[PDB]
Amino acid sequence: AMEGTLTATVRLATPADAPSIAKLIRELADFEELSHACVVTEEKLHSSLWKLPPFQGPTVLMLEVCQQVFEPIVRSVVLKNPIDDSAREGFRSPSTGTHTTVGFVLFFPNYSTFLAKGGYYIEDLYVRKPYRGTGLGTILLKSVVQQAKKLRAGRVEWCVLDWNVNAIKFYEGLGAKVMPEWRICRLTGEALEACAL
Amino acid sequence: AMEGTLTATVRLATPADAPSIAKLIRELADFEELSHACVVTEEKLHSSLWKLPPFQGPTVLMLEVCQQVFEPIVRSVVLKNPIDDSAREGFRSPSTGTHTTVGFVLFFPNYSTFLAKGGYYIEDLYVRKPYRGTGLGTILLKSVVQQAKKLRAGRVEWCVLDWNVNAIKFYEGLGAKVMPEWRICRLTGEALEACAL
Numbered sequence: 001a002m003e004g005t006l007t008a009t010v011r012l013a014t015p016a017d018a019p020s021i022a023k024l025i026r027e028l029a030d031f032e033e034l035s036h037a038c039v040v041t042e043e044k045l046h047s048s049l050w051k052l053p054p055f056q057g058p059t060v061l062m063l064e065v066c067q068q069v070f071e072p073i074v075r076s077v078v079l080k081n082p083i084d085d086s087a088r089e090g091f092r093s094p095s096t097g098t099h100t101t102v103g104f105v106l107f108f109p110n111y112s113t114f115l116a117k118g119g120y121y122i123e124d125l126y127v128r129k130p131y132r133g134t135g136l137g138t139i140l141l142k143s144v145v146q147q148a149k150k151l152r153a154g155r156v157e158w159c160v161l162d163w164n165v166n167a168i169k170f171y172e173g174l175g176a177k178v179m180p181e182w183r184i185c186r187l188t189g190e191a192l193e194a195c196a197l
Numbered sequence: 198a199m200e201g202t203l204t205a206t207v208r209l210a211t212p213a214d215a216p217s218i219a220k221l222i223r224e225l226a227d228f229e230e231l232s233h234a235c236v237v238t239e240e241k242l243h244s245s246l247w248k249l250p251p252f253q254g255p256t257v258l259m260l261e262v263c264q265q266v267f268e269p270i271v272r273s274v275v276l277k278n279p280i281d282d283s284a285r286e287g288f289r290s291p292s293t294g295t296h297t298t299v300g301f302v303l304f305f306p307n308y309s310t311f312l313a314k315g316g317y318y319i320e321d322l323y324v325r326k327p328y329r330g331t332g333l334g335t336i337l338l339k340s341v342v343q344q345a346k347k348l349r350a351g352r353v354e355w356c357v358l359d360w361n362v363n364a365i366k367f368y369e370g371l372g373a374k375v376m377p378e379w380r381i382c383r384l385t386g387e388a389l390e391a392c393a394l
């Protein structure tokens with residue numbers, strides 16, 4: 001239904017975006033088949049995000065489309081194939097009514113001990129199913145990398161499930177290196193509460 | 198030379214710890230045999246650390262020993278073996294002249310979108326050779342975990358080398374889980390410089 005060219009906008013999320021973000025987090029949990037592990041609510045986003053200045057704590061960028069600290073990034077995209085979005089009314093942008101929310105990225109600063117320099121870690125990057133494969137995920141990730149470089153970051157890092165070959169190829173298509181020697185350790189739930197001096 | 202019991206103190210690093218932190222980071226890089234990729238200087242530490250409130254950005258806790266917000270953790274430690282430290286004079290603590298700096302831990306907040314809660318990520322944790330194998334590294338790790346639970350962190354995370362099976366065993370014994378499917382991706386150097394919109 002959406003044909004030709006679209007105008008993509010990447011912009012800083014505000015508290016008004018909390019419901020769209022909760023919806024996109026839920027969709028992302030389904031994609032990773034971890035919907036049971038996802039307990040996100042809008043109140044939890046209000047309690048944990050927008051506490052610190054952007055790029056100084058957990059920060060979210062929204063990706064929205066329409067047709068024709070961080071300033072919004074606006075780029076035109078020629079659609080690879082027409083877009084059939086049967087959920088556009090549920091993703092209407094709260095900022096500009098005539099935009100459709102199709103994605104988000106959540107990231108926060110990290111630190112390299114050997115560089116003695118801060119960087120950025122991308123925790124989540126998601127684009128709604130009808131909008132994948134036409135350059136939108138690239139714009140969104142490139143927007144974070146762009147601001148990170150403006151803030152003199154040494155590295156930009158993120159994780160990847162080794163079976164998400166679609167994301168692997170996408171990430172390596174941007175010059176990133178998938179490191180094979182590192183494993184994440186997580187202490188949480190009962191074990192975290194039981195861990196004591 | 199050092200026998201019986203020592204008093205171990207874990208405290209927040211201040212900018213006065215930068216010379217010891219840089220020495221300890223060089224020792225850590227030397228241990229992991231990545232000293233050429235290690236460009237840490239005290240000036241870099243002064244430019245990247247102690248800029249945000251502790252536990253709100255990259256934070257270092259110092260571990261020191263003697264023989265008799267974050268409040269210091271002071272614990273008595275029974276020495277499993279006599280300790281001979283010839284680097285003692287080079288690691289005299291600023292906080293107290295009679296204390297010896299034996300280690301450090303660097304960590305920063307992270308964020309879980311599935312929990313919609315901030316957590317903590319431990320980037321590096323090091324203890325000097327003469328003081329290993331007597332419980333000090335465990336006190337350092339549990340000191341970060343204890344503060345993370347007090348700040349109601351959802352998770353506490355770190356990375357491990359996949360071949361370091363002894364570390365996987367110890368972390369598993371603590372209740373931590375080594376995730377099998379996650380890989381770290383890194384965008385740095387010329388690829389980071391070329392990544393543009």
Ligand SMILES: CC(=O)SCCNC(=O)CCNC(=O)[C@H](O)C(C)(C)COP(=O)(O)OP(=O)(O)OC[C@H]1O[C@@H](n2cnc3c(N)ncnc32)[C@H](O)[C@@H]1OP(=O)(O)O
Nearest residue numbers: 124125126127132133134135136137138159167169170173
């Ligand atoms: C921990 C995490 O969050 S991992 C993040 C990944 N998330 C997921 O896997 C969830 C579901 N997937 C998605 O949301 C998305 O598909 C993403 C985020 C992986 C990528 O977003 P997309 O919009 O699909 O990517 P985009 O279209 O920009 O680029 C992907 C491919 O298109 C190519 N491409 C780049 N620019 C364009 C363009 N203008 N037009 C068409 N294709 C393009 C890239 O070279 C890349 O090629 P490859 O995958 O064949 O190697």
Ligand SMILES: CC(=O)SCCNC(=O)CCNC(=O)[C@H](O)C(C)(C)COP(=O)(O)OP(=O)(O)OC[C@H]1O[C@@H](n2cnc3c(N)ncnc32)[C@H](O)[C@@H]1OP(=O)(O)O
Nearest residue numbers: 228320321322323324329330331332333334335355364367
């Ligand atoms: C959490 C992290 O990021 S640790 C990863 C970096 N660790 C390194 O390998 C750097 C060099 N090693 C060291 O500085 C230390 O030996 C540390 C930091 C691993 C802690 O060791 P200790 O002070 O000896 O631990 P402690 O005496 O409390 O525990 C007994 C044993 O438990 C294990 N253990 C304790 N803490 C750790 C840890 N953080 N990682 C892996 N194994 C550990 C070790 O096998 C240790 O014996 P070791 O000193 O002979 O290696």
